[PDB]
Design a protein around this ligand. Structure first.
Ligand SMILES: CCOCn1c(Cc2cc(C)cc(C)c2)c(C(C)C)c(=O)[nH]c1=O
Lengths: 415, 537
């Protein structure tokens, strides 16, 4: 078959990223998964003349009790020529339900340009280094590579045409190995309609393995300030401090009248009666805070940033934006049942959940700013990772005021 | 002889061309020998004569260790493309073997053919008596000693050749390192012996030969400072050069070995000796050992007199990791399967940086142990930590940063690590409230720091040669000092907001440390921050 030539962006070279240590379990599985792929001619052993390398590891999807291979092609992707690919529909962000399907298997039936294969090199390590690693290189379109869906575009659209034309009411969006199907239909009709697509696809060779996404349950919550019968010097102080900060997002926020009440050296516990003016100032701030700041629009030609703060007691807040203080979306996240004592497990889930929304809403993974130590993250994140893609990320030190503010986000009266 | 193996395509780095170094001039005695030696190599097929159509050249020399040639590939190497082992196996990760046999494959480099396309760059020349007629010219047909690509290509070829044998005999372990092949197994001595000979003949099939008993290595194996014995491994003797005159350099070298050794012998100390370097003017400067240095250098000699042995890995047994807090910022750990039969020991040193706490440091040591464990035994140990579950749960569920400890267990081995203090979540009723403040002139460095309490008390100090940050921290210090066992402190310092969140118990700043000690002295402390310049005195 025809192999469309692929090329690195100009002036770029292949990736030379070190493989991270893997546990016995994971190594055994990769060996198993790879010997099989070798026979099927999907991949081939390579020599030391090839200097490139991309890291690989193994995971097990939810419910899934079988190991799947995952390659960190982030570097190779960043360096792969762009394709002038697949458009994004403003529809599924609205649709009542969205289902995610793994059509990653499909690519293995397509061959990859001979001249590019060398860059896909990777290494299965060995315990305690008692043996040389086992070096492979792909012969067919690999999963997780951005070139993949771009080249298998023509073929996917075709395969899909029948179902699309029969259901112009249902939205289909492709991102990486994932296929997002969205419809406003009935849970029964939606799910069953999935299978129709699923089998339809299965009918070509690509086994396509709650679970429903419900865009429009992702409504941005407002900030709510506390209310008391009696206010103490400490209460005003904490408030004023929070407000003074928020003024970076809402300039109409004033705290001059409250500060007035804080003149003097009183005991932090002493109660203070509010003046009619400071009472009004407060009323106005609440008012101002009733809606997201005006004039914030998504700029496609700029990166999305996702900042996450550890609130405590299994709670996490996050904000997505392109410019500080002009949030496109925000929220909270409470730990999944079972993550009882694992901060990393939670954070990992949070990233996946957040990233998925980013895909549905904008069709772009956000760059993460994680409230965790590099060493800690790299050591354990793959132990709970379950998506086929991998967002970009950097590690940071959460400013005290940022989490004090978002901790204030409104919650349901009951549920 | 040369073997029928497929060559590896090799090429120079993009752009650059083959080396052209002029041949160093040699004497009659040097030339005569080289000619001799090369005539030998050419007959074996190792190298081949070439005509001046080859513009490349590398300098050859003659050294006596009978004469022996030497080629300087520094240039060619610099021009050779790059290749993808530099991760060494650690003794603690090996599994006990009934028998280990080591085969030599020394001149195997000259047994592996070189890319016929690359051979041309390997050209060198044999000079004449002085500066007269053109000399003899050759080039390699095999992997040459000293070339950047030899080791890698050799390794790979070896792996290929060993594949079928490794398959047929899965119960046999081979470890290649340099030109040695360590074959081990749990078969019966006679059976093991038999297999080695099969392997040997399997190798001979590919030209690769094997020498006689004359130079056949046998346990113990001296490897990277370790002593590999069949039942256990020990550490190679660390001797301290007992001299009377000590130069700056000598001292530094000492501190080096001693620091390396502190891992195995956790008792070692070098503080008193690491003061002998203060203000040193020259590397060769002679320093008189202080009495304290004599005492220290002395004890270490005793410690290093003791024999420390470890044992090997048994996959059928679980992995235990136990940690101890030697002092502040110092940790020791041992990993074993059977109590007192350590597979590995070690220790961690820290700088305390801007601001950390003991619990945080504990987690970091765990992480480091965990990672190396994964590298060595492909598994993560079960931890035994000197910290109560209570303390842990109280600290991590509140810490601003994500953190974690794999499956662990509390071990009551003093001194337990604990939270030195905890700021109050709410203001203390019936406690003095100090409104602290500090201001400094960034340029004159003239500062003032002080406070005023709801109780009517007050103070203010004038600081000379100070920064703003200091006058701030200092105001907080004064309140801590002049207050009782319970205090409420409000400050508009951005840094106070720092310690509120992190509540560290070790800092780089002496002032911060002062404060921390004070923080620990109190029963209850509530630290509050408010906007600066907002008229909230
Ligand atoms: C006699 C002890 O030799 C160490 N030894 C060995 C041999 C061995 C020898 C040397 C110099 C280094 C290394 C890393 C291993 C093996 C294998 C790799 C053959 C083994 O499985 N187990 C073991 O204990």
């Amino acid at each position: 078959i025809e192999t469309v030539p692929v090329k690195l962006k100009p002036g770029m070279d292949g990736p030379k990223v070190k493989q991270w240590p893997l546990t016995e379990e994971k190594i055994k599985a990769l060996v198993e998964i790879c010997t099989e792929m070798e026979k099927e001619g999907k991949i081939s052993k390579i020599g030391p003349e090839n200097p490139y390398n991309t890291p690989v590891f193994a995971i097990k999807k939810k419910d899934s009790t079988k190991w799947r291979k995952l390659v960190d092609f982030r570097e190779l992707n960043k360096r792969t020529q762009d394709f002038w690919g697949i458009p994004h529909p403003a529809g599924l962000k609205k649709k009542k339900s969205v289902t995610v399907l793994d059509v990653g298997d499909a690519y293995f039936s397509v061959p990859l340009d001979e001249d590019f294969r060398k860059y896909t090199a990777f290494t299965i390590p060995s315990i305690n280094n008692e043996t040389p690693g086992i070096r492979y290189q792909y012969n067919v379109l690999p999963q997780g590579w951005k070139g993949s869906p771009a080249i298998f575009q023509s073929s996917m659209t075709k395969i899909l045409e029948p179902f699309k034309k029969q259901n112009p009411d249902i939205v289909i969006y492709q991102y990486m190995d994932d296929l997002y199907v969205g419809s406003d239909l009935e849970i029964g009709q939606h799910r069953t309609k999935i299978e129709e697509l699923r089998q339809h696809l299965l009918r070509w060779g690509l086994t396509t393995p709650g679970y429903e996404l419900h865009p429009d349950k992702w409504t941005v919550q407002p900030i709510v300030l506390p209310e008391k019968d009696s206010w103490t010097v400490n209460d005003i102080q904490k408030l004023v401090g929070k407000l003074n900060w928020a003024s970076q997002i809402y300039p109409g926020i004033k705290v001059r009248q409250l500060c007035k009440l804080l003149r003097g050296t009183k005991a932090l516990t002493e109660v203070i009666p509010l003046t009619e003016e400071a009472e009004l100032e407060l009323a106005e701030n609440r008012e101002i805070l009733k809606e997201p700041v005006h004039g914030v629009y998504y700029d496609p030609s700029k990166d999305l940033i996702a900042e996450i703060q550890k609130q405590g007691q299994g709670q996490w807040t996050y904000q997505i934006y392109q410019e500080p203080f002009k949030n496109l979306k925000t929220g909270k996240y409470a730990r999944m049942r079972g993550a009882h004592t694992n901060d990393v497990k939670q954070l990992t889930e949070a990233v996946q959940k957040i990233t998925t929304e980013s895909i549905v809403i904008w069709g772009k993974t956000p760059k993460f700013k994680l409230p965790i130590q590099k060493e800690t993250w790299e050591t354990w994140w793959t132990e709970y990772w379950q998506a086929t893609w991998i967002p970009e990320w950097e590690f940071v030190n959460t400013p005290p005021l940022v989490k004090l503010w978002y901790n204030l986000e409104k919650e349901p009266i009951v549920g | 002889p040369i073997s029928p193996i497929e060559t590896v395509p090799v090429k120079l780095k993009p752009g650059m061309d083959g080396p052209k170094v002029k041949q160093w001039p040699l004497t009659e005695e040097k030339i005569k020998a080289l000619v001799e030696i090369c005539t030998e190599m050419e007959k074996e097929g190792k190298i081949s004569k070439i005509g001046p159509e080859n513009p490349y050249n590398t300098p050859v020399f003659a050294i006596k260790k009978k004469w022996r040639k030497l080629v300087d590939f520094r240039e060619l190497n610099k021009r050779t493309q790059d290749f993808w082992q530099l991760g060494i196996p650690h003794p603690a990760g090996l599994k006990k073997k009934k028998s280990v046999t080591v085969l030599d494959v020394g001149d195997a480099y000259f047994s592996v053919p070189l890319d016929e396309d690359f051979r041309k760059y390997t050209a060198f020349t044999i000079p004449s008596i002085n500066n007269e007629t053109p000399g003899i010219r050759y080039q390699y047909n095999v992997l040459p000693q000293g070339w950047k690509g030899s080791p890698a290509i050799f390794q790979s070829s070896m792996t290929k050749i060993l594949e079928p044998f490794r398959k047929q005999n899965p119960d046999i372990v081979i470890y290649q390192y340099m030109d040695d092949l360590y074959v081990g197994s749990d078969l019966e001595i006679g059976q093991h012996r038999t297999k080695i000979e099969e392997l040997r003949q399997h190798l001979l099939r590919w030209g690769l030969t094997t020498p006689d008993k004359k130079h056949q290595k046998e346990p113990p194996f001296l490897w990277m400072g370790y002593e590999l014995h069949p039942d256990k491994w020990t550490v190679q003797p660390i001797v301290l050069p007992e001299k009377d005159s000590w130069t700056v350099n000598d001292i530094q070298k000492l501190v080096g070995k001693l620091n390396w050794a502190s891992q195995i012998y956790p008792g070692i100390k070098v503080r008193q000796l690491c003061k002998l370097l203060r203000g040193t003017k020259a590397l060769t400067e002679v320093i008189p050992l202080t009495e304290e240095a004599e005492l220290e250098l002395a004890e270490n000699r005793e410690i290093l007199k003791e024999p420390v042995h470890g044992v090997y890995y048994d996959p059928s047994k679980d992995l235990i990791a136990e940690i101890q807090k030697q002092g502040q910022g110092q940790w020791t750990y041992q990993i074993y399967q059977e109590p007192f039969k350590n597979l590995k020991t070690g220790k961690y040193a820290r700088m305390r940086g801007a601001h950390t706490n003991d619990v945080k440091q504990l987690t970091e040591a765990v992480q480091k142990i965990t990672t190396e464990s994964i590298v060595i035994w492909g598994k993560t140990p079960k931890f035994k930590l000197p910290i109560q579950k209570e303390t842990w749960e109280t600290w991590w569920t509140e810490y601003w940063q994500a953190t974690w400890i794999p499956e662990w267990e509390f071990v009551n081995t003093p001194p337990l690590v604990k939270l030195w203090y905890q700021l109050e979540k709410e203001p203390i009723v019936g406690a003095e409230t100090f409104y602290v403040d500090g201001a400094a002139n960034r340029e004159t460095k003239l500062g003032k720091a002080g406070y005023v309490t709801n109780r009517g008390r007050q103070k203010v100090v004038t600081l000379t040669d100070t920064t703003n940050q200091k006058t701030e921290l200092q105001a907080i210090y004064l309140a801590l000092q002049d207050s009782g066992l319970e205090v409420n402190i409000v400050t508009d310092s951005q840094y106070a907001l720092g310690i509120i969140q992190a509540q560290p118990d070790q800092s780089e700043s002496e002032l911060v440390n002062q404060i921390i000690e004070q923080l620990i002295k109190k029963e209850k402390v509530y630290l509050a921050w408010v906007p600066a310049h907002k008229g909230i005195g």
